Amino acid sequence: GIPHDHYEPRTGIEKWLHSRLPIVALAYDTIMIPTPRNLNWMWIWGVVLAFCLVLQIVTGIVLAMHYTPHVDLAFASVEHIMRNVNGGFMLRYLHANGASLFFIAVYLHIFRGLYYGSYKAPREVTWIVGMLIYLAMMATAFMGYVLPWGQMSFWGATVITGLFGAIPGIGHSIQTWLLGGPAVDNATLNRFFSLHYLLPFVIAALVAIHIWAFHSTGNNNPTGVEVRRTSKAEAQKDTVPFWPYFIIKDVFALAVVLLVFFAIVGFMPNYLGHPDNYIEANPLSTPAHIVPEWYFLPFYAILRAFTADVWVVQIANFISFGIIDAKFFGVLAMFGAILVMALVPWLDTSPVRSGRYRPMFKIYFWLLAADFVILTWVGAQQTTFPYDWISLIASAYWFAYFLVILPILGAIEKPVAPPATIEEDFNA
Amino acid sequence: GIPHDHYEPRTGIEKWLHSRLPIVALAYDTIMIPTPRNLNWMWIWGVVLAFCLVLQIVTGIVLAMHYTPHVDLAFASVEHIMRNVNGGFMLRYLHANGASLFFIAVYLHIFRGLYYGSYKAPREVTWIVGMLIYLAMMATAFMGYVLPWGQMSFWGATVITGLFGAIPGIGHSIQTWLLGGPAVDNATLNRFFSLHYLLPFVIAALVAIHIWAFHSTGNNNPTGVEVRRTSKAEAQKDTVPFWPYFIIKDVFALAVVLLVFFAIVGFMPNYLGHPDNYIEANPLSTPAHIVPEWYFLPFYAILRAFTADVWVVQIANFISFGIIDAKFFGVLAMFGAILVMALVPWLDTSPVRSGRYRPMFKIYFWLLAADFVILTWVGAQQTTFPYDWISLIASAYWFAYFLVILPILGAIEKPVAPPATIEEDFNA
Amino acid sequence: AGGGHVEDVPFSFEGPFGTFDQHQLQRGLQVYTEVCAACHGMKFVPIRSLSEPGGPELPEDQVRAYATQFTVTDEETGEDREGKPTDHFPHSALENAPDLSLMAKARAGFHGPMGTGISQLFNGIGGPEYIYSVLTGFPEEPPKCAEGHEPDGFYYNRAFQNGSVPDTCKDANGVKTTAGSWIAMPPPLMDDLVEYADGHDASVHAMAEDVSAFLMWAAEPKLMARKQAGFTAVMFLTVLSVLLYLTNKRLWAGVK
Amino acid sequence: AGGGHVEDVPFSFEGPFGTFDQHQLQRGLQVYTEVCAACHGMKFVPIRSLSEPGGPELPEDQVRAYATQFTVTDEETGEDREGKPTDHFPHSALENAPDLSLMAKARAGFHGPMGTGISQLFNGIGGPEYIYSVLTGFPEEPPKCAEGHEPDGFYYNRAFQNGSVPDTCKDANGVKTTAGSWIAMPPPLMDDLVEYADGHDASVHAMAEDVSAFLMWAAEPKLMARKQAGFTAVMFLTVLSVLLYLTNKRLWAGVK
Amino acid sequence: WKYRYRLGGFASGALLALALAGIF
Amino acid sequence: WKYRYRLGGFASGALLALALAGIF
Amino acid sequence: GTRRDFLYYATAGAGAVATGAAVWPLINQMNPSADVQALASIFVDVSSVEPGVQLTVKFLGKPIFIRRRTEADIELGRSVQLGQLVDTNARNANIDAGAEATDQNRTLDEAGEWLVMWGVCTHLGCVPIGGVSGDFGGWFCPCHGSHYDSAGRIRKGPAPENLPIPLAKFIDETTIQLG
Amino acid sequence: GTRRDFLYYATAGAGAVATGAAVWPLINQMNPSADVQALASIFVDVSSVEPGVQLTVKFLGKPIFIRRRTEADIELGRSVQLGQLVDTNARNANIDAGAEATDQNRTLDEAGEWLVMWGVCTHLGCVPIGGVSGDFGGWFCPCHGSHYDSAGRIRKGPAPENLPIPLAKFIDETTIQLG
Ligand code: HEC
Ligand code: HEM
Ligand code: HEM
Ligand code: HEM
Ligand code: HEM
Ligand SMILES: C[C@@]1(c2ccc(Oc3ccccc3)nc2)OC(=O)N(Nc2ccccc2)C1=O
Ligand SMILES: C[C@@]1(c2ccc(Oc3ccccc3)nc2)OC(=O)N(Nc2ccccc2)C1=O
Known about the structure:
With 24 residues, chain E is an all-alpha fold. Chain E contains 1 helix and no strands.
């Protein structure tokens, strides 16, 4: 609700079109939203994510024109794309590394939101829409990685379907429904291909809702102080129009990010992959060291952390009369990590918005960031000593950050006064 | 811009959500748009078209989980759907006859627009968006019909690609690009499958634009008289809220239409198809008589009508120094039929909007309706006597209606006065 | 080509309340196995479908014994083995003989009256009728015009409308005078060619009707399920439409 | 299993400006044809790619002759025939010999430093260096722990890791003490087993290096295209980045 | 008892559809 | 000529990109 | 509005029933098809299988292990009592469901020489590695480091159950009917 | 203006160049791939072909006709004069592009006995029915009604041109090389 000017048709065609369909007025209001003038470089990841979604959709639509979702032909079709179709190697590598770019971008986006309190009121709806987008992205990437039908694709599908089948009572039925048979086979591949095509458009719709939500609430800034709505002049002293200023800033940031991304794609496409996925799927043999993609490693580690011998697992088993065993407890913990990440807007009870003015929250947030990196690193390691203890401690801290630390800090912390206005921060 | 009440939160959760994302307000304004009281049963086809789009998308999504876009597997995969996957026969017949339902609904929609002047000002943008939707629907149905990979699929693809190959100069290159090879082959099938998945979502976006466009101007009525914007009382005196008065009306109409559609699907699913499509595609032999689907027969007939012997074809050949030959002239005529349908808002120069008060426009409109039916009928016939002459006359009248008759009637006609208000029409 | 004349047959599966006659389908399977299967094949028809409901509904053990008569190349090892119920019927042993899986849906016995499609609306597609007419459409003596000019390796068929015709039987305009055409298939049926256990007569008419019914089942093995689903949907939508009509009437009574 | 040691070879294709040595790829092709092909195959590599630019780049007549030596079961007909350049290399003749098409991308050559992926970040994936290490990694005599305990039908290789290991070579808590493990492939390269065109050195190290390079090209033929595309896109985004920087700078000059 | 028609109407409408749909 | 800088800038910017991209 | 509410909610209920009837097939079509459900038993020849060598076959899209246990494997498997087993159930489909996980109840013959088993880890479905791996002279699942005894019983790791045994029998001297 | 516009439009131009460089592959990937473009000639064994029988063979996705013409077919063919023909170009890849559509320029041998041509109607690509059909004792296209003569030349109907003749030649007494 930041005061600002409204669209005015200038030329004849604009006047003709405005009276019939105010699409140009909507576009003007969208690109002319007054945004804070003190945003730092961590706000550039939204445009990066928009570009990543568009790139993934375009490259995937291109690839689907040549890929056959059949077990006897999927690997061969991917090799045909790599070797025969014009520039198909570049398109395949772009679509493969675009997932990595997309997920590094969303993790940076999410941790910016966590640091600066962008999840806090009145921005809960934006956070919830984002969490839905993230779940959709995870599912889309899972099915996409299954589509090549290599060793890693096959056994990752096996592991994820087993996790679904770990649910008590209804687990076997849900696993059979997702698989379409006793095990991962052609039906699973075909339906995964169909849903992999479907999901990105749902993600695009959710992203449109995301954009509308953050437009309604208004952009957040590092200071955490909202723009002044008292008058147009004061609002202008705290903001600049999104176009041309932040359009150009974010486009420049995206250009640098794309420079790095294209260098990676053109000189080391296989660094972020796994060599075993260049082996045709073998249902009768598993790779010795199956490893998920890096963007699923932290939650895979959280899944692996809780074994049968952990005290909380034993307590859960006892209280549930054996219904909740170690396997299902691990599944529940893996999903509960996402659950607390979603429920953060109601767990953080502190009144001050930005973490810049929260002395203890800084320490705990940077511990959380280090913990996320440690979970990523330890997911790829074996469960033997000392990795089991490291994973247990990392998962415990991840849960304690949301369930324990944030509510307490909301009560015992002593923040410092933010600036009176965004103008005061910008002029310094 | 019809005056009416606005959304007002009453409960706690609604007040909480309104300040964060006014989505409930948007939904309320959408379903509470005042609409004329005198709309007749011909306004029900928009909801029918929306349901047809949703049904086609859902049925196609479930079908794609079992269909293999490979020449050695496509026909086998479709028969697997028919025979093996539980409910697959009903789903495939639903998706096959949904195209017929979609196109019969769209033609009724279009001809209602033509009769009642719903294309006239200020509703040109809605008509243009609809024309784009119709082109997208045609492309989607074409590429869907090739996926089964029967005889009709193969040779319809061959003919439709030859149409593009007929363009002078760049035609061969465009045909090769659209085929990915010397003839229709696995590349063509795969790219067609990918684009058949893609296009319906583009159609959905265009339909959203359609909805917004007709929300901006309002709804047209048989009377042709716009709602009174002078005050809220008068606006309510000419209109009723869309919910429930027209929601229930259109839902009932859709229920009856679906009764008929499900009876057709359950007791004669393949009446609207061709038996030849139940034969595996044979590149080395053509069916003794290839026939398009009924919703393409009119424009197929328009394509067939103009042979080398026609005087206008000879004139075009002479003026173009042989560049425009009979084949390319026929292709141009087929596309120009849809073109002249497209820009009817600028050819119809009659001030009065509704065709009910135009005494002699009715004659030509019903002649056009009979002409469209005759084109449908004659498309399936051979080009021998007397079918060639009646086809030529039908195409000539189709072009003369938009290019000749409507501009002249805009000048010489003497329409009768419409009612003063929609209230006067509804109360008699 | 064009549309021929097919003798309409009252099959048991015609109309909304149509159901496959189980015994007739079993007889059709028998006559297919002993006559048609020599030259033809049904690559899209699983053998296990013989045991499914709404079909021949043979016992599981009988179907498993029946499947053993086929020699099939194993996909796993590429070696010949006895057939199993999971395997489809063999392909056409004779090349110039199409697949009979979808023949009952790949042919339209009814055409006209003038391309309007009204005949099919009241008579159906007529694929089974076309098959019946083709099987019984071989006369003892060919047409008199063709005599002395018959193509070698072809036989006249009153129902076939896609084969060659001798120059003698053609007219000045170039159209064939004979109703039929020359097909590349000898008369397959013959009186008492198959011994039915239940004692049903084995005339060419009865056998042809049985084969047509069985081939209709093979083409659309879920026809009865389709009709049941259609009735269920029609009744749901009928109740819903009546309720919606009453609701709309009550709602609009306020403003009217 | 695990990931052990490998010999770092300065392959020409390594590096942003690295490119295939066409002669080296021709030598590797010869070694593959005369040695490896006896057991291995490359079912994904089209033979015609022996003339595609950025590879061995043979004259198409030579390729056609090379392709003729293979027997191929025609995809349609079924009867065998001579191989065309449109055909792929044959499957592995030996059941348990893996396909070498993607071998140079299916194996990791470096592991570490502490599961941080930094070594791969600076040294590459290492596929060709692991192939080189397996070919050249057959010692003269086995480890001392295995004399008289070798699994029958296997041979000790320094670089292979997914192989069985005699119980005499593991320690007290299950960890193997030998650098390598027992592979089922006999030492395929022996000094001067090939006679080269240009009389080039044909030691085991030379043949191993050449075949590694050839297998790298076989796994990724478009590597030189990939790096040209990369350098291009980088130069473009670099120019655009500089211009967008100066633009953002002059644009913000007025606000702040 | 506070919602006889709202509740009974919903169930009655559902039963009429299901009860009749099973006639065939 | 009135748009010498607007026209010259667009072409010059495009050439600087294509010209450099062909230096590999 | 008694009659008004009755009519409106009856319409809503009929609509809900129709919606559910339409929705259920959309979910149901993802269940196993008649083609998948029709898969029946297979026959495996074990005429050329010696002691100590495992044979991996494909059944229901999963690996099945047929192992001729050696004398050492038989001796090791029979030593362990029920006390140290993670789960007591043999999980053998060929005998009573309540039977204990004894070596006699984990094999197709009274001498324990043969062992037909699902080669699918009960934790999340990986394939345990044979060759007397693990810390118990049996199989070792490397996906999460689980150990299975010489008789296939779970001894260590996150696996909650022993490797299941499907229906099997020696119809001939050197043939096993799986399924 | 002098420098304000230059920088912005230079940035726009660089962006447009990058956008075009990215867009072009998205379109070029739909062109024929390496495998499609590699399809070379084929060899047909015409050892068993009496006069009057046509031999239809798949090549580059489409049918190729190889008909051994009879006494009458060749008589009729050589009787038609270049003026009576709708299209006077031979449309033959072997002889020069300017060659006239005489019967001797439509066959491979001087006897005019072997006629090899794409069985692809030049209107919209259907396969004409052969075996002496139509009004000119040649081929009839049923898609729209095109008539061809015993030489494969268009005589009546929508088809603009004659049926093309591939680069074809006899490699031996009984073997033809197509393409
Ligand atoms: C049979 C006489 C062989 C010939 C000649 C060559 N190879 Fe081989 N190879 C063979 C077998 C039986 C195996 C599997 C070994 C096992 O224990 O599984 C292999 C495997 C390879 C591998 C993969 C090694 C790995 O760690 O996965 C490679 C890289 C390999 N072989 C390379 C190779 C080359 C380059 C050859 C020609 C110089 C060659 N092999 C010949 C059997 C035989
Ligand atoms: C495809 C995925 C996403 C895209 C394209 C996207 C895009 C954007 C954009 C353009 C903005 C505007 C400000 C900015 O650019 O930083 C934004 C803001 C924001 N996003 Fe996202 N986002 C995505 C996913 C997510 C996710 C997964 C979350 C949280 C889990 C999230 C949470 C937020 C928050 C809290 C804001 C702040 C809004 C405000 O301050 O008003 N986003 N996003
Ligand atoms: C958010 C959007 C998307 C994400 C995150 C995503 C992610 C992925 C990933 C990680 C892979 C594995 C690639 C590999 O291992 O080689 C993949 C493969 C694939 N994806 Fe997507 N994808 C997205 C959208 C799409 C779309 C819209 C389509 C088609 C319309 C598509 C089609 C494919 C195909 C055909 C493959 C297999 C070919 C290949 O391996 O490159 N994807 N996807
Ligand atoms: C899937 C395709 C389409 C859908 C879902 C759709 C839907 C609708 C709906 C819901 C309306 C509101 C009034 C009504 O329902 O009658 C409408 C109005 C209209 N439609 Fe469409 N339509 C489609 C295609 C088209 C096409 C192809 C055309 C013309 C070529 C067209 C032209 C119009 C016009 C002129 C109106 C009148 C709007 C007004 O009176 O303000 N529509 N359409
Ligand atoms: C406006 C939307 C759509 C229209 C008008 C449409 C139309 C058609 C038509 C006419 C056919 C031919 C059916 C036959 O001949 O048997 C077809 C087939 C097919 N369509 Fe669509 N379709 C639409 C959307 C979709 C979508 C979104 C998908 C995938 C998600 C899809 C997947 C398929 C498949 C797999 C087939 C082949 C299987 C079959 O023949 O039923 N369609 N479509
Ligand atoms: C990309 C990836 C993935 C991503 C995300 C992802 O989240 C989900 C988590 C829970 C439910 C649904 C989706 N599930 C897989 O897909 C895939 O098969 N693997 N490999 C792999 C290997 C071993 C174990 C697990 C996964 C991945 O890492
Ligand atoms: C459904 C159908 C179709 C619909 C619509 C359609 O419009 C288009 C017109 C121009 C360009 C793109 C689409 N083009 C085909 O697809 C198809 O292959 N046939 N059969 C068929 C058989 C013989 C000749 C022509 C077509 C159809 O009738």
